[PDB]
Amino acid sequence: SLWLSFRYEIMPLYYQSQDVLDVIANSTSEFMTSRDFVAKAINIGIPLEWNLDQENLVSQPRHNVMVKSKLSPENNIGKTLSVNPFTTAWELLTLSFVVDWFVNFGDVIAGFTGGYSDDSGATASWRFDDKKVFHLKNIPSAMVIVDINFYTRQVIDPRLCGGLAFSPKLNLFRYLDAMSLSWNRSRLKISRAT
Amino acid sequence: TFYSPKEIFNRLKDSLVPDTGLVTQVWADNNTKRMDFLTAMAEIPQTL
């Protein structure tokens, strides 16, 4: 009856702790991306002595820049929190095992903030499709035809570019992690003493 | 006369440079929705 009673003592805070905090943490990260493109003109200067009417080999490909952001969850904690069923055999669970489970839970909950920020990457691409036909100076009957067509993809180079963003790392380690670190007193009073 | 397609494409890849203006624009667009989501997260720490 007394183990029954202690199970009953601990069962509501169980709902407050393992369930509510989990569902709170479930609202993290999201698959977002931003898209854009350009028809930028790329020219190659050519002297007129090169038998042309024009002087610049101008190309206007489709250059597009893709940035995708899945942002940030919790460093793939997962099963360490997905270990709920440990409350099924209260008839034999001991003080210590349940208590240590709760302590490890309180530990990983605090480690949320430091282990939160993950961010995402980005890239770019070009799609060349150009066919420039050049007359010959004073000779309309003579021509040059240059046709170019290809699509090429490049990363956004997260070293130079690829940063230059919000960086959600900030505003969160300035947050609880150091002040909610105060929870250590809670574990102090927890530890069968104080 | 015209240049060879080989050297033309060589000059093209040498001329291949990412659009800094587009990069800035898309980074701003990303950070917009990024802080939009971060706004919702504002009260999670207090619950924690």
Resolution in A: 8.6
C-beta atoms of B37 and A154 within 8 A: no
Strand order through the sheet with A62-69: A32-38, A62-69, A122-136, A139-155
- Give how far B43 is from chain A: nearest CA, Å: 10
- Give how far A3 is from chain B: nearest CA, Å: 29
CB-count burial class (<10 Å; 0-12, 13-18, 19+) for A28 = middle
CB atoms within 10 A of CB A89: 9
> Rounded to an integer, what distance in angstroms lies between the CA atom of residue B6 and that of residue A127?
18
First to last CA, chain B: 73
Instruction: Identify residue A126 by its one-letter amino acid code.
Output: W
> Rounded to an integer, what distance in angstroms lies between the CA atom of residue A64 and that of residue A58?
18
Of B1, B9, B44, the CB nearest to A50: B1
Structure tokens at A74: 């919790």
* A chain contacts of residue B9, beta-carbon cutoff 8 Å: 148
- What determination technique applies here? cryo-EM
* B chain contacts of residue A37, beta-carbon cutoff 8 Å: 22
- Give how far A2 is from chain B: nearest CA, Å: 32
For chains A and B, CB pairs below 8 A equal 118
A34: helix, coil or strand? strand
CB atoms within 10 A of CB A64: 20
Name the DSSP class of B43: G
Structure tokens at A79: 């099963």
* A chain contacts of residue B40, beta-carbon cutoff 8 Å: 27
* A chain contacts of residue B39, beta-carbon cutoff 8 Å: none
On whether the CB atoms of residues B48 and A112 are closer than 8 A, the answer is yes
Of B12, B18, B29, the CB nearest to A154: B18
C-beta atoms of A146 and B2 within 8 A: yes
- What DSSP assignment string belongs to A35-84? EEEE---B--B--GGGT-S-SB--B--EEEEEEEE-----TT-GGGTS-G
Of A20, A168, A180, the CB nearest to B34: A168
Using the Cα atoms of residue A159, residue A160, residue A165 and residue A167 in order, give the sign of their dihedral: positive
- Largest Cα span, chain B: 74
